[PDB]
Scaffold this motif. Structure first.
Motif, mmCIF file in Angstrom:
data_model
loop_
_atom_site.group_PDB
_atom_site.id
_atom_site.type_symbol
_atom_site.label_atom_id
_atom_site.label_comp_id
_atom_site.label_asym_id
_atom_site.label_seq_id
_atom_site.Cartn_x
_atom_site.Cartn_y
_atom_site.Cartn_z
ATOM 1 N N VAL A 1 1.159 1.912 -10.801
ATOM 2 C CA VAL A 1 1.449 3.295 -11.174
ATOM 3 C C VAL A 1 2.665 3.300 -12.095
ATOM 4 O O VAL A 1 3.669 2.643 -11.821
ATOM 5 C CB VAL A 1 1.739 4.159 -9.936
ATOM 6 C CG1 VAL A 1 2.059 5.579 -10.359
ATOM 7 C CG2 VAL A 1 0.567 4.184 -8.972
ATOM 8 N N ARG B 1 0.829 -1.218 0.000
ATOM 9 C CA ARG B 1 0.000 0.000 0.000
ATOM 10 C C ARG B 1 0.849 1.247 0.000
ATOM 11 O O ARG B 1 1.888 1.287 0.671
ATOM 12 C CB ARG B 1 -0.873 -0.002 1.250
ATOM 13 C CG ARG B 1 -1.859 1.160 1.386
ATOM 14 C CD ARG B 1 -2.697 1.025 2.657
ATOM 15 N NE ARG B 1 -3.605 -0.106 2.570
ATOM 16 C CZ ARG B 1 -4.825 -0.067 2.045
ATOM 17 N NH1 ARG B 1 -5.340 1.050 1.540
ATOM 18 N NH2 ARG B 1 -5.545 -1.176 2.014
ATOM 19 N N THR C 1 -11.500 0.489 -8.947
ATOM 20 C CA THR C 1 -11.194 -0.872 -8.468
ATOM 21 C C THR C 1 -11.486 -1.886 -9.566
ATOM 22 O O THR C 1 -11.934 -1.497 -10.635
ATOM 23 C CB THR C 1 -12.042 -1.219 -7.219
ATOM 24 O OG1 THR C 1 -13.418 -1.315 -7.589
ATOM 25 C CG2 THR C 1 -11.905 -0.128 -6.154
ATOM 26 N N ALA D 1 -2.714 -3.373 -8.817
ATOM 27 C CA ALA D 1 -2.673 -1.917 -9.039
ATOM 28 C C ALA D 1 -1.264 -1.436 -9.394
ATOM 29 O O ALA D 1 -0.289 -1.729 -8.700
ATOM 30 C CB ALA D 1 -3.163 -1.177 -7.821
ATOM 31 N N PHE E 1 -5.063 11.368 -7.753
ATOM 32 C CA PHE E 1 -4.297 10.665 -8.775
ATOM 33 C C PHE E 1 -4.359 11.534 -10.004
ATOM 34 O O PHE E 1 -5.434 11.709 -10.582
ATOM 35 C CB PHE E 1 -4.935 9.304 -9.056
ATOM 36 C CG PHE E 1 -5.099 8.466 -7.823
ATOM 37 C CD1 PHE E 1 -4.001 7.918 -7.202
ATOM 38 C CD2 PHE E 1 -6.336 8.319 -7.241
ATOM 39 C CE1 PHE E 1 -4.151 7.210 -5.998
ATOM 40 C CE2 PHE E 1 -6.503 7.579 -6.068
ATOM 41 C CZ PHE E 1 -5.401 7.022 -5.450
ATOM 42 N N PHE F 1 -7.267 2.073 -6.639
ATOM 43 C CA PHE F 1 -6.940 3.476 -6.415
ATOM 44 C C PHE F 1 -8.117 4.089 -5.704
ATOM 45 O O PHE F 1 -9.168 4.237 -6.294
ATOM 46 C CB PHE F 1 -6.639 4.198 -7.754
ATOM 47 C CG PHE F 1 -5.488 3.576 -8.493
ATOM 48 C CD1 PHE F 1 -4.196 3.913 -8.174
ATOM 49 C CD2 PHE F 1 -5.696 2.531 -9.398
ATOM 50 C CE1 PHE F 1 -3.135 3.295 -8.802
ATOM 51 C CE2 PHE F 1 -4.624 1.927 -10.036
ATOM 52 C CZ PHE F 1 -3.359 2.280 -9.712
ATOM 53 N N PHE G 1 -2.367 5.117 -14.269
ATOM 54 C CA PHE G 1 -2.897 4.275 -13.216
ATOM 55 C C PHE G 1 -3.673 3.111 -13.823
ATOM 56 O O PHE G 1 -4.674 3.324 -14.512
ATOM 57 C CB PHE G 1 -3.804 5.142 -12.320
ATOM 58 C CG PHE G 1 -3.120 6.397 -11.845
ATOM 59 C CD1 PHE G 1 -2.209 6.356 -10.777
ATOM 60 C CD2 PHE G 1 -3.306 7.601 -12.506
ATOM 61 C CE1 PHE G 1 -1.549 7.499 -10.404
ATOM 62 C CE2 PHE G 1 -2.651 8.756 -12.123
ATOM 63 C CZ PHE G 1 -1.767 8.702 -11.062
ATOM 64 N N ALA H 1 -5.450 9.635 -0.352
ATOM 65 C CA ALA H 1 -5.215 8.813 -1.536
ATOM 66 C C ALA H 1 -4.483 7.527 -1.180
ATOM 67 O O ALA H 1 -3.410 7.588 -0.562
ATOM 68 C CB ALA H 1 -4.416 9.575 -2.584
ATOM 69 N N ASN H 2 -5.059 6.399 -1.610
ATOM 70 C CA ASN H 2 -4.535 5.057 -1.345
ATOM 71 C C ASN H 2 -4.375 4.269 -2.625
ATOM 72 O O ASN H 2 -5.265 4.248 -3.487
ATOM 73 C CB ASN H 2 -5.473 4.250 -0.427
ATOM 74 C CG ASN H 2 -5.447 4.726 0.996
ATOM 75 O OD1 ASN H 2 -4.837 4.088 1.866
ATOM 76 N ND2 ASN H 2 -6.122 5.836 1.264
ATOM 77 N N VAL H 3 -3.213 3.643 -2.759
ATOM 78 C CA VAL H 3 -2.963 2.667 -3.813
ATOM 79 C C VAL H 3 -2.760 1.342 -3.100
ATOM 80 O O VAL H 3 -1.905 1.248 -2.202
ATOM 81 C CB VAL H 3 -1.680 3.000 -4.586
ATOM 82 C CG1 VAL H 3 -1.412 1.975 -5.703
ATOM 83 C CG2 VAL H 3 -1.741 4.410 -5.154
ATOM 84 N N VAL I 1 0.726 10.709 -7.471
ATOM 85 C CA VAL I 1 -0.117 10.347 -6.340
ATOM 86 C C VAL I 1 0.196 11.358 -5.266
ATOM 87 O O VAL I 1 1.356 11.506 -4.883
ATOM 88 C CB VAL I 1 0.183 8.943 -5.814
ATOM 89 C CG1 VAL I 1 -0.719 8.625 -4.619
ATOM 90 C CG2 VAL I 1 0.039 7.915 -6.934
ATOM 91 N N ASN J 1 -13.148 6.460 -6.676
ATOM 92 C CA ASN J 1 -12.223 5.330 -6.684
ATOM 93 C C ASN J 1 -12.255 4.565 -8.008
ATOM 94 O O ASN J 1 -13.165 4.719 -8.822
ATOM 95 C CB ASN J 1 -12.464 4.412 -5.484
ATOM 96 C CG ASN J 1 -13.807 3.701 -5.558
ATOM 97 O OD1 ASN J 1 -14.063 2.948 -6.491
ATOM 98 N ND2 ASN J 1 -14.673 3.965 -4.608
#
Lengths: 116, 120, 117
Positions: B69, A59, A81, B67, C72, A72, B74, A65-67, C67, A79
């Motif tokens: 980047v 993470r 997903t 996920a 984003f 995302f 993204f 903001a979270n990845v 980010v 979001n």
């Protein structure tokens, strides 16, 4: 001798003739390019620390903001997903006119139809 | 202090003697930008050498499960993406869309239904 | 003694009997599991450096992709932020038919109406 303490661990005694090793941990066991922390040396024996160009984590958090493995996510916001995109009860702007059947349409396109 | 050796990822040893200086350095991610060292190394009290990330890190890729980047944006592997060439909704619905107002805003089903009520 | 010089800082002198400590800094004061840089030791006292599984930063920059606390952002392109989504003045593709009142609508659904009306 001198002593090397890592965080809360007991000291490592560094005697005459001892070797201290620094190791970048491999994220993927067979892959020498998978070390998140890139430790190298310079022409004057400097010990150099950087990140790998490719980092592997579970993470990343930057405020809301979270990845992560789910995707995302903006806490309380939009979001993206595996199940798709949520626009967070906000407008989607900057949308060029859709062309193919599964392109989004914009207000201008709805208005065109409304006049025909 | 006794003479000792420092081995970095199985490089040839660095011999450290009495009188030697050992340097640790954070590498700059951006050639001329002093504030671009991804690994922030400092000294505090009590001979503490402190390691952290820069508040701003510069990489080419972050991988967190499916996920990703990257310089293209993204991406969810097998899913939607938001990249330089546009958003791909992944053959899934886009939900939680507020009513579009400007000509280049997306429209929602409620708005399509408003039109159905207006035209014929 | 030997000396340790970290970046441009003043040297640390390490004599016989001295201790040097390597420490991970906590990203959050109340979270001892928030040290971004994970430093441990191996079964022959190797000093092992990795990232935490969870990293906390202000910004990640990968080319134009960012980010940060706002969300984003692709510089000059699409974004997904606290204020919503911008499609980057480009088309949005791969949109399944909207169903519920706040679902997006695609070209096919606009055409379906055109064919009925």
């Amino acid at each position: 001798a001198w002593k090397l303490v890592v965080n809360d661990e007991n000291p490592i005694d560094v005697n005459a003739g001892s070797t201290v090793k620094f190791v970048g941990v491999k994220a993927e066991e067979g892959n020498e390019d998978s070390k998140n922390i890139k430790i190298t040396t310079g022409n004057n024996n400097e010990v150099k620390f950087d990140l790998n160009d490719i980092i592997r984590v579970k993470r990343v958090i930057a405020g809301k903001a979270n990845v992560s493995e789910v995707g995302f996510v903006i806490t309380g916001g939009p979001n993206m997903t595996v199940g798709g995109i949520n626009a967070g009860n906000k407008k989607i702007t900057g949308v060029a006119n859709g062309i193919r059947e599964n392109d989004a349409v914009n207000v201008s396109q709805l208005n065109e139809l409304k006049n025909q």
